[PDB]
Amino acid sequence: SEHVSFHVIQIFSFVNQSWARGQGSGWLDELQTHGWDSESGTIIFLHQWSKGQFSNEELSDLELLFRFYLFGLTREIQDHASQDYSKYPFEVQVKAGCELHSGGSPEGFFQVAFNGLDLLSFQQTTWVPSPGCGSLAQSVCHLLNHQYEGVTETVYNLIRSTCPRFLLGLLDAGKMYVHRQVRPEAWLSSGPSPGPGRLQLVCHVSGFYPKPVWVMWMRGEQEQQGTQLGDILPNANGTWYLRATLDVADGEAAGLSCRVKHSSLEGQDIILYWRGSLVPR
Amino acid sequence: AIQRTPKIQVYSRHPAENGKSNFLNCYVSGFHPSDIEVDLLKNGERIEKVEHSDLSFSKDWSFYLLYYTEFTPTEKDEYACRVNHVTLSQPKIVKWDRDMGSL
Ligand SMILES: CCCCCCC[C@H](C)CCC[C@H](C)CCC[C@H](C)CCC[C@H](C)CCC[C@H](C)CCCOP(=O)(O)C(F)(F)[C@@H]1O[C@H](CO)[C@@H](O)[C@H](O)[C@@H]1O
Ligand SMILES: CCCCCCCCCCCCCCCC(=O)OC[C@@H](O)CO
Ligand SMILES: *[C@@H]1O[C@H](CO)[C@@H](O)[C@H](O)[C@H]1NC(C)=O
Ligand SMILES: CCCCCCCCCCCC
């Protein structure tokens, strides 16, 4: 569609020679669409449309591939760090997936972190160490490029061929279920004291999609300088929450309001009037 | 990397109305490593039935989670989010408050 991404996220925690945990999920931009069952090693389809347009045969093969990859990764890593390597515990993060850009080619990527630091990434046919993570990254890349050579071609085809085709199907399958525009609710409250002789007003805007939104405090038609947008936080099922606050000094006159503009509203802004006190506690 | 202590933000989905059902959200973000204990609390006890996302992470590789559950706000009842993590010496508790923006 526009820029839209599909991401598989994996987290491997290695606790000792005999214990590790794998965890994984699939995300359509900011909406989780897939989980992973770590007990039985299977894909969890979180929505009715999470299979996209893939057949059960294709998804069976993909589930097997994932099991093979995860068991082999665990086995190899645990083999190479034996008994008393002071590295334990450590954690490996993997971000792999694809992006569609409107009118241009898709992009595929496969990035790895060791203990939260960039380690290596996959570059079309080669594992390339991050220039920042030194000797360990070089050793891992040696093994991946020379020993497991015959799976490079899989990774490439997975992230650059299979992933875009799947994402296109997923987007198409969600069209009978998912909203492209969700309207927010909004309400007013007070906030914590900004200081003596002052109070804080809060305009809450909850449950809107997509993410771009405009919110300002107003005196009639005059936008107020003290308006400040908070961080935008997630809600359930890929929607968003925002707080817009205003600091007010003792002596400000009644008649303030909050005005919310959003594409889901399309010409009918929400306007909320403050009906409480403006005398600071 | 360096260990990163989690940031905790608490907020309700709908305007708070005593005796009317609502949803309580807790967004925990920016932390590393991934081992974490997040609970939503009603009067200091963990709510046994909650919804949570899977772990995701930002592009600095730090993790984030979203928790939410149904709840009915009340004069007496205290609802909160409790987090423990290796960067924390004991569990950190962030209370939900109407008279503030739960800010
Ligand atoms: C925690 C897991 C993730 C969570 C899942 C969450 C759910 C998931 C989001 C659901 C969405 C599905 C979408 C469509 C995914 C879209 C693409 C994604 C971006 C790609 C991400 C890259 C993946 C992760 C890495 C695997 C590559 C590995 C290096 C290759 C394995 C090589 O193994 P292999 O040797 O080549 C063999 F093929 F297995 C052989 O096959 C024979 C069979 O007959 C067998 O008998 C032989 O012995 C042998 O095993
Ligand atoms: C059925 C598939 C078989 C394998 C699955 C694919 C996973 C392969 C990944 C191998 C990773 C191995 C990591 C090795 C780490 C290491 O060897 O460390 C080097 C030190 O010597 C640093 O100096
Ligand atoms: C490895 O860690 C797991 C999880 O803490 C523990 O149950 C197990 O006893 C440990 N194994 C050894 C050999 O220490
Ligand atoms: C000592 C442990 C090194 C960590 C190895 C991580 C390599 C992940 C790349 C797997 C791609 C198939």
Author numbering:
A (entry chain A): 5 to 285
B (entry chain B): 1 to 103
Kindly provide excerpts from the paper associated with this entry.
The synthetic mycoketide lipid moiety was used here to generate three new MPM analogs with predicted chemical stability. These synthetic analogs comprise a carba-mannose, where the ring oxygen is replaced by a methylene group (MPM-1), and two C-mannosides, where the anomeric oxygen is replaced by a methylene group or a difluoro methylene moiety (MPM-2 and MPM-3, respectively). Of the three MPM-analogs, MPM-3's headgroup appeared to be best stabilized, through an interaction with Phe72. To accomplish this stabilization, Phe72 adopted a g+ conformation at a torsion angle of 89.6°, compared with trans in the other two analogs with angles of 171.3° and 181.0° for MPM-1 and MPM-2, respectively. This suggests that Phe72 played a role in the orientation and presentation of these ligands to TCRs. We also observed a considerable movement of the CD1c α1 helix in the CD1c-MPM-1 and CD1c-MPM-2 structures compared with the CD1c-MPM-3 and native CD1c-MPM structures, with up to 2.1 Å difference at Leu74 Cα, which appears to be ligand-induced. Of the CD1c-MPM analogue binary structures, the structure of CD1c-MPM-3 most closely resembled that of CD1c-native MPM. Protein crystallography demonstrated that the phosphate group of MPM-3 was highly stabilized in a configuration comparable to natural MPM, which was supported by the difluoro methylene group. The difluoro methylene itself was turned away from the CD1c surface, which may be the reason that it does not interfere with TCR docking. In addition, the difluoro methylene causes no significant change in pKa of the molecule so that it carries a negative charge under physiologic conditions, like natural MPM. Overall, these results show that the analog MPM-3 is able to withstand processing to PM, while remaining antigenic for the CD8-1 TCR.
